[PDB]
Amino acid sequence: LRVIKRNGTVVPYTDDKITVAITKAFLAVEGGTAAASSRIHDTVRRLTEQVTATFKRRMPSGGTIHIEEIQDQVELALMRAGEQKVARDYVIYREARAAERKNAGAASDVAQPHPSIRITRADGSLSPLDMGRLNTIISEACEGLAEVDGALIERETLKNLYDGVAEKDVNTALVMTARTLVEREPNYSYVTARLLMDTLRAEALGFLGVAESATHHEMAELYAKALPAYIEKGAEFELVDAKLKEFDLEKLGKAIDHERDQQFTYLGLQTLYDRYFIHKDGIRFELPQIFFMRVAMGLAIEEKDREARAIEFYNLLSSFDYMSSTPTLFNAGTLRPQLSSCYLTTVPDDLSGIYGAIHDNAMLSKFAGGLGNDWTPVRALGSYIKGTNGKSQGVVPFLKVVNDTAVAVNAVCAYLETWHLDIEEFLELRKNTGDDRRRTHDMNTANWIPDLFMKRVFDDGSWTLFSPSDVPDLHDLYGKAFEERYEYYEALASYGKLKLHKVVQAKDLWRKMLSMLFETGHPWLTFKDPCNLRSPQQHVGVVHSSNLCTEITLNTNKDEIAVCNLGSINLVNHIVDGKLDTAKLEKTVKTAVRMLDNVIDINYYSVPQAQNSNFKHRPVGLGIMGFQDALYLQHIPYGSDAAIAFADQSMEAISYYAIQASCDLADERGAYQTFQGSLWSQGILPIDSEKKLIEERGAKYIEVDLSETLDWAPLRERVQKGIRNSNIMAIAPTATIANITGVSQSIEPTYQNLYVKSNLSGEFTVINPYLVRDLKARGLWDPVMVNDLKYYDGSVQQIERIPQDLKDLYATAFEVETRWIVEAASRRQKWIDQAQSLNLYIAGASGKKLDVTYRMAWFRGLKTTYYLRALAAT
Amino acid sequence: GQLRVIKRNGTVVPYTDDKITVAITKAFLAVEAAASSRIHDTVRRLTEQVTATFKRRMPSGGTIHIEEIQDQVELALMRAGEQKVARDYVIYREARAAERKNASIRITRADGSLSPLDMGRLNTIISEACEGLAEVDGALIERETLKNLYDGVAEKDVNTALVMTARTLVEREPNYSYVTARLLMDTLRAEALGFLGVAESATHHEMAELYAKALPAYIEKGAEFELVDAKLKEFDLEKLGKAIDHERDQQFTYLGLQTLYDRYFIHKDGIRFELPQIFFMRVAMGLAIEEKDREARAIEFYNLLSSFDYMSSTPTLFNAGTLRPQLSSCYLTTVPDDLSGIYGAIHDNAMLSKFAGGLGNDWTPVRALGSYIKGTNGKSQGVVPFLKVVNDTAVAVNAVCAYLETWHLDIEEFLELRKNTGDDRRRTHDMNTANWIPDLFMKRVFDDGSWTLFSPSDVPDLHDLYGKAFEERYEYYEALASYGKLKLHKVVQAKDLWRKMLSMLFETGHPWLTFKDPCNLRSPQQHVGVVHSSNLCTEITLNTNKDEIAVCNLGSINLVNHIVDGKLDTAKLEKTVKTAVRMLDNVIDINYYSVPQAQNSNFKHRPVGLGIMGFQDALYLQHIPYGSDAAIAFADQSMEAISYYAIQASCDLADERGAYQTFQGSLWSQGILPIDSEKKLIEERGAKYIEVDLSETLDWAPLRERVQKGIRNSNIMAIAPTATIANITGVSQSIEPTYQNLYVKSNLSGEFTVINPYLVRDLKARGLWDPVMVNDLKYYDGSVQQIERIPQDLKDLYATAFEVETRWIVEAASRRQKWIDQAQSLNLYIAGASGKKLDVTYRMAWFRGLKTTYYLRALA
Ligand SMILES: Nc1ncnc2c1ncn2[C@H]1C[C@H](O)[C@@H](COP(=O)(O)OP(=O)(O)OP(=O)(O)O)O1
Ligand SMILES: Nc1ncnc2c1ncn2[C@H]1C[C@H](O)[C@@H](COP(=O)(O)OP(=O)(O)OP(=O)(O)O)O1
Ligand SMILES: Nc1ncnc2c1ncn2[C@H]1C[C@H](O)[C@@H](COP(=O)(O)OP(=O)(O)OP(=O)(O)O)O1
Ligand SMILES: Nc1ncnc2c1ncn2[C@H]1C[C@H](O)[C@@H](COP(=O)(O)OP(=O)(O)OP(=O)(O)O)O1
Ligand SMILES: Nc1ncnc2c1ncn2[C@H]1C[C@H](O)[C@@H](COP(=O)(O)OP(=O)(O)OP(=O)(O)O)O1
Ligand SMILES: Nc1ncnc2c1ncn2[C@H]1C[C@H](O)[C@@H](COP(=O)(O)OP(=O)(O)OP(=O)(O)O)O1
Ligand SMILES: [Mg+2]
Ligand SMILES: [Mg+2]
């Protein structure tokens, strides 16, 4: 055994040097009277033995170890023996002599580090790294952001570079060490996006022949030069609609604001660049502000004032005040643009029309469309079939054809009404096990529940199943009319005059519905009668189901496939110093509704009955997003009366402006064809729809708040003169567009304040930017807090240092009681003419808890519910 | 209690685990990115350790300093092996300490009002607490206590701070034990005098006048609440108040005063209103309640108790002077061989244990497994199923020791009743056990003979026979059984059973070894009964029958107070013994008897048991090592003188009160004193099997002549364990050698290390007491054998229990037993664990004429 001295030399391993060292430390804390002590000597030689033994235990016949490796094991032996005073003075003294070595080494230091790395160009030529341009992009990137250190990033980058780096991976190196900093300061996310933009500018501009490279503020003059170059190459490759050349590109080139690139989060820019920016040969040649300008232009190709409206639409989009739906963003400004990709259908009870509906499913899904299918009219197991002289097997064998079409065309949701004789088989279609002939693992399902069924649940009544072919009028009836006609058929079956039927207990079927929702996630629960009694289009059709995402309530028939034309307001951009900017909200809603009305005319239609319904009724669906983040800005916890109040009044405000905007389009473009007879014609607004719903169903089964903070009487008058759209509002999921704009999803509570993305190199944690901002004000943002958040997967509950006001404000989806989410949705639904996609989160998971929850959802006048997220751990 | 942390700048905050967790976590994070997931869990363990250490150090709460916490955090990290984190914690902590160095008090009275701290009174109570003590520093106490105070500190917590400060200094200078006690007295005075209303507070000097005022108030208030016998009002309370000596409160050690305050001083609604000297006067008055000259005897008894020259037994201290006083709580019974008497005996156990009494049960007469029962036509299952009922009764009434003779056919099951594993129906985990060993059995061991087991129902006379009559009769039954004339029996080798007995004593601690024949042959009462067993603690040898439950009336002499100038003070010793024997004879008459068999035996035979304590300390004051012939001679001659004065005292009481009812026929009437009965035992057993020193130093012949004229007590002497009364008087337990010279008292008040005060005094006298010596003693757990600086004479003197050869203990015990008419509780200590060493140890105990042995404390 030998030891590597501090500097090179090798010497034999001598226990004495260890024994002397430890003895020095004992004699330092004690006096000299400890010099001759059997105790010290016995202790030291014991510590020296277990140290020397440790080196023997890990190695065979001799070896070599570092001098510091021995010092560490000496401290270990002293420490494990509980020698606190001797161990710490050993550490202190040892560190004092390390300081003298470190300092003396720095005094004798010589400086060589030079020159610089040579950046390799694409053509293969070497070039010295530009330090001036490197400082420019990182400074313009840290511009306007707090607690960001540009010099810190430049130093950490400069480390991981080698002679012969390419300018390609010099930017990625800047990005790599920029997102590693978002964990301790979220504002680096903006810095990370601004650095990545440098690659995009070089990529796009170099492709367009404008410039081989450029900085941010250099875009103040280059965005106008790049736009006409972009349109010319875009149309050349048939990636952009040639009609866009009819715009005044010089005027639009000046309207572009290059500073809005600074708004992007890293995730938002990645999203657009990966999937939305136009490209050729893998090269993205569409820059972000030109992307927003393309969408604006595509939405204005038929406006009288092309440029003025295009600028109005570009300003709304590029500022993140509002964001068009995913299909609009992707296809606006391109040939035959699919601007809407959400449809509702109803399937007729004949074989030709069944397979006509299968055919429509395939065509509508050819470009990623989502579908709701009303299958209630199709006759159930045991029904007679003339011509065949046999008996039907019901809807499920046809749903299997639907299921395999969805697989073949690359989602769809089937709806069935609760008295349908196939309902029991329907509830089990998504079980993991069992007969596969009775499963549709690639198709969604939803219950179309009449009020009467829930009434029978509340009252422990019975419930009769029928085949629709024996009761063909029930599906189209609703409200009192349905309940009278249904009880007539019920009495008929009890007197043997309607053979094909099944009597069950309503509570038993209800329990089966909730257990399948819990076990399989399906079928979802949607309510037929509020969707129909509150539909503004009752005079010209019937709502036969909702859509794939359960927020749309539009009529369907033989000649009408309803189309959802969607967009969402960004509530975050309408919160100022803690308050809702009522004034700015009206301006954004007015422009949003116009853009959505334009979508109807520009949209390219594949099936004629989808064009027919859109042109006849002109429904749109204006939603919201950033609700949870808007609560943060007001310091309102989602589980409070104050959040329920904000949800009520914010929807009432948007609703007023949205309805008012539709009146303005009616003055300019004329009311939609079927306006005459609609609820709007009768002066029955959504707030009035709630009142009549309570009258119809009865206060015994529904209770909803009816408060109002605005004056609707003047608007209730102007609406009767005409509006442009049969439906205005719908709150849909906003997965992509919330990520693009950097806000929370629609109305969802935060699912978790922390997530650990891991998809390239290492894993990068992302923490709720609002949570960290509040923890700074309290002075509670530090390394230990970060280590606690990871341990608790982002939950601020049960960490002592956070005060209770923040534990409540940053409660996660599974630690907010479900009643808050339902009551909030209930008050938003008072002002929405369609519905809202409502995910529910339930910890504890019991059939009892599901019962009280979905009874409450119905009792509070909700039209739809969506996914159930259930945990049985609590 | 409330754990309060004192900041670096005086302020006070509540104790919060989180502060420690955050600090330790920062150090973990300073070292390390993916393996950082285990930080939260390991840190929470380390925090829990630290919090548990302060809970264990301050179970009732208290104050603590930041730097004290910091040191416990470091120690916790260091013991866990977190070398990287620990060293980084140290470096950072020192860095901040470097940075820091460069860059009034009011009290909350019980009524909630505030007032500045009376510095003047604080100086006086500290100064008066240091009176007469060397190496005590009143200024240090004041400065160190002030560091632990703060603005708004509760009144009581000031005294607590004083007591805690003084208590930690006990390990540096033992006299601080007296300081700690005297400082504690201040809260006792305020608590008691405020309750009685004679004063709201008082200093020690003020008690010179206030004790006399507080005695009448105490008797009246106590009598009113039925906590004191109303007859104590008949005493001249003025004359007894003047007799109280306030300076005797300055004698208390901290442990002794704390013991009296927690468990003895009369209390009402949680308030002790009985002060120490009043406590001793109540006991004295309680023991003098039937005396002709009540005041003179009460003063006589008060002077004996309050001086610590002698201390009555715990039950006497508890209950003397109260209504229906249980002054004795130690009993012996014998269980007859019939079911009604078996359950009568169990009924007696419950009744006698109703107030913490201890019991010795003789179960030998109950017939063994296999015996015929004419109740039915079945077989007995032995004594153990009934011992199970005894066990459950001890548990339900919560202390009981069952005795079984060595030929009993259930003995092998009896030997295993305290094993930790096995069938619980063959175990009695809450009941003690002891062997009742005949001399013949040991003779068989010495000679490697056989041994036959019988059921007592076939040999019902053996248990009461002893000596040569037992041996003749036993060998008759032995031969009778060898050829079929005795159905139920079992032959074994005596050596094999003896090995099992010793193996069970070592592995389970039970059963103990006691010797039936020395107890009976030397009993003064052989003419009226038979000793059937010893008691719970193995020091008492008294007769029992169906009409007589024996009662132990006990007290012990403090030998420390009878050594002056390194020599035994026989004049003072004579005075102490005479008064002590009187007090014990009074206990018999005053004691309330709930069982008539107990009253009958006490009134007929009037046995008492005067013992000793402080023997080890008495050796220190003479510089006599326990392991030396000088210790044997002191053990011999000190008990000889005590026994002489005690026998003389009992003659004096017979002159005054009459001899006890069964005196005629006793060994006393035959002129057979304990020294004579020892010589008789030698002749009876045979010199081959016993050897005891028979030297005398006193002139016993005239006393032998006087004893035959009449004595007051059938038995006089017994060395009991003195755990509590030795702690009250601050002396070593009974005859035990020092167990350890250094240990950690882990009380509910906190923790403090105690160091042998005689050892510290001798080391100071030689200039060897310093911090290095302290750490040497802590390292070696009090042992001085491996400390080179300590001279050899002190190494011998301060050897501890496991370092004194067991032969020394047995010989000293053998010499004491020459003079004692009953027995002595004798613990033995064996460091070398082996059956061979156990064999020679307990053979020697029998061979040296010992009556009993007690616990075996062993190591391997
Ligand atoms: N022969 C050896 N074998 C093993 N460990 C050794 C040996 N010599 C030294 N060490 C270890 C034990 C101590 O922790 C430390 C010794 O410190 P020290 O005696 O000062 O030696 P060193 O390497 O620092 O040289 P120097 O004499 O200048 O101090 O290194
Ligand atoms: N006064 C002291 N207090 C505490 N520990 C000490 C003291 N003196 C020595 N030691 C311990 C810690 C050191 O590692 C070792 C002494 O070796 P020493 O050579 O003086 O230090 P070192 O090896 O760490 O540095 P260097 O040799 O470079 O001066 O023993
Ligand atoms: N061969 C078949 N296999 C399975 N289902 C069938 C078959 N033929 C008909 N059906 C089902 C599909 C429809 O739900 C229902 C009605 O079928 P359809 O072709 O429309 O007859 P129909 O409408 O001309 O006459 P009717 O409705 O009066 O019986 O029967
Ligand atoms: N209230 C408390 N309860 C328990 N331990 C505490 C408390 N305050 C501090 N500590 C202990 C835990 C660690 O050993 C150490 C941590 O020091 P620290 O948290 O910095 O307190 P501090 O007195 O130094 O105040 P600060 O550092 O905030 O000025 O002190
Ligand atoms: N960076 C660190 N490295 C190692 N240990 C640390 C570190 N930070 C804190 N600790 C440990 C030791 C510190 O005493 C404690 C945190 O207390 P801290 O307030 O930072 O210092 P301190 O309490 O010793 O002095 P002060 O509080 O007066 O600044 O936890
Ligand atoms: N039912 C029983 N179960 C167990 N042991 C019993 C039972 N009855 C008696 N014994 C035991 C208890 C004694 O040790 C022994 C003698 O008891 P017991 O029959 O009451 O005495 P005895 O004197 O009245 O009758 P015996 O004529 O048999 O001596 O038998
Ligand atoms: Mg060195
Ligand atoms: Mg600190």
PDB file of C-alpha atoms and ligand atoms in Angstrom, chain A residues 347-355 375 377-380 383-389 391-395 397-398 468-469, ligand 3:
ATOM      1  CA  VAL A 347     -77.696   8.451 -37.799  1.00  0.00           C
ATOM      2  CA  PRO A 348     -81.014   7.402 -39.401  1.00  0.00           C
ATOM      3  CA  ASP A 349     -82.693   4.067 -38.702  1.00  0.00           C
ATOM      4  CA  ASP A 350     -82.137   2.601 -42.173  1.00  0.00           C
ATOM      5  CA  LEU A 351     -79.227   0.558 -43.481  1.00  0.00           C
ATOM      6  CA  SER A 352     -78.438   2.898 -46.379  1.00  0.00           C
ATOM      7  CA  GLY A 353     -78.416   5.937 -44.095  1.00  0.00           C
ATOM      8  CA  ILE A 354     -76.405   4.052 -41.490  1.00  0.00           C
ATOM      9  CA  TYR A 355     -73.710   3.416 -44.092  1.00  0.00           C
ATOM     10  CA  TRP A 375     -76.926   6.633 -32.640  1.00  0.00           C
ATOM     11  CA  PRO A 377     -82.532   6.444 -33.706  1.00  0.00           C
ATOM     12  CA  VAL A 378     -81.131   3.031 -34.714  1.00  0.00           C
ATOM     13  CA  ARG A 379     -83.361   0.179 -33.541  1.00  0.00           C
ATOM     14  CA  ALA A 380     -82.166  -2.064 -30.737  1.00  0.00           C
ATOM     15  CA  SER A 383     -86.492  -5.207 -33.115  1.00  0.00           C
ATOM     16  CA  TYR A 384     -88.283  -6.477 -36.207  1.00  0.00           C
ATOM     17  CA  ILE A 385     -86.758  -5.942 -39.654  1.00  0.00           C
ATOM     18  CA  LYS A 386     -89.094  -6.140 -42.642  1.00  0.00           C
ATOM     19  CA  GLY A 387     -87.659  -7.639 -45.820  1.00  0.00           C
ATOM     20  CA  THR A 388     -85.213  -9.652 -43.725  1.00  0.00           C
ATOM     21  CA  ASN A 389     -88.061 -11.205 -41.692  1.00  0.00           C
ATOM     22  CA  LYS A 391     -84.502  -9.492 -35.774  1.00  0.00           C
ATOM     23  CA  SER A 392     -81.938  -6.734 -35.345  1.00  0.00           C
ATOM     24  CA  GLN A 393     -78.828  -7.227 -33.233  1.00  0.00           C
ATOM     25  CA  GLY A 394     -78.873  -3.556 -32.269  1.00  0.00           C
ATOM     26  CA  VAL A 395     -76.450  -0.704 -32.627  1.00  0.00           C
ATOM     27  CA  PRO A 397     -72.356  -4.288 -34.524  1.00  0.00           C
ATOM     28  CA  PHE A 398     -72.607  -1.000 -36.421  1.00  0.00           C
ATOM     29  CA  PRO A 468     -86.599   3.478 -30.933  1.00  0.00           C
ATOM     30  CA  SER A 469     -88.429   1.739 -33.800  1.00  0.00           C
TER      31      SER A 469
HETATM   32  N1  LIG C   3     -79.379  -7.320 -43.086  1.00  0.00           N
HETATM   33  C1  LIG C   3     -79.406  -6.530 -42.010  1.00  0.00           C
HETATM   34  N2  LIG C   3     -78.523  -6.764 -41.015  1.00  0.00           N
HETATM   35  C2  LIG C   3     -78.554  -5.984 -39.931  1.00  0.00           C
HETATM   36  N3  LIG C   3     -79.357  -4.952 -39.662  1.00  0.00           N
HETATM   37  C3  LIG C   3     -80.221  -4.744 -40.666  1.00  0.00           C
HETATM   38  C4  LIG C   3     -80.312  -5.467 -41.843  1.00  0.00           C
HETATM   39  N4  LIG C   3     -81.331  -4.973 -42.643  1.00  0.00           N
HETATM   40  C5  LIG C   3     -81.826  -3.984 -41.939  1.00  0.00           C
HETATM   41  N5  LIG C   3     -81.199  -3.783 -40.739  1.00  0.00           N
HETATM   42  C6  LIG C   3     -81.495  -2.727 -39.782  1.00  0.00           C
HETATM   43  C7  LIG C   3     -80.867  -1.388 -40.127  1.00  0.00           C
HETATM   44  C8  LIG C   3     -81.861  -0.384 -39.559  1.00  0.00           C
HETATM   45  O1  LIG C   3     -81.560  -0.089 -38.195  1.00  0.00           O
HETATM   46  C9  LIG C   3     -83.201  -1.114 -39.663  1.00  0.00           C
HETATM   47  C10 LIG C   3     -84.084  -0.696 -40.813  1.00  0.00           C
HETATM   48  O2  LIG C   3     -83.507  -1.146 -42.056  1.00  0.00           O
HETATM   49  P1  LIG C   3     -83.963  -0.569 -43.451  1.00  0.00           P
HETATM   50  O3  LIG C   3     -82.959  -0.922 -44.523  1.00  0.00           O
HETATM   51  O4  LIG C   3     -84.057   0.878 -43.375  1.00  0.00           O
HETATM   52  O5  LIG C   3     -85.418  -1.021 -43.896  1.00  0.00           O
HETATM   53  P2  LIG C   3     -86.619  -0.032 -44.238  1.00  0.00           P
HETATM   54  O6  LIG C   3     -86.425   1.288 -43.610  1.00  0.00           O
HETATM   55  O7  LIG C   3     -86.720   0.097 -45.757  1.00  0.00           O
HETATM   56  O8  LIG C   3     -87.945  -0.701 -43.661  1.00  0.00           O
HETATM   57  P3  LIG C   3     -88.546  -0.653 -42.187  1.00  0.00           P
HETATM   58  O9  LIG C   3     -87.744   0.423 -41.456  1.00  0.00           O
HETATM   59  O10 LIG C   3     -89.982  -0.147 -42.334  1.00  0.00           O
HETATM   60  O11 LIG C   3     -88.457  -1.980 -41.514  1.00  0.00           O
HETATM   61  O12 LIG C   3     -82.898  -2.521 -39.778  1.00  0.00           O
END
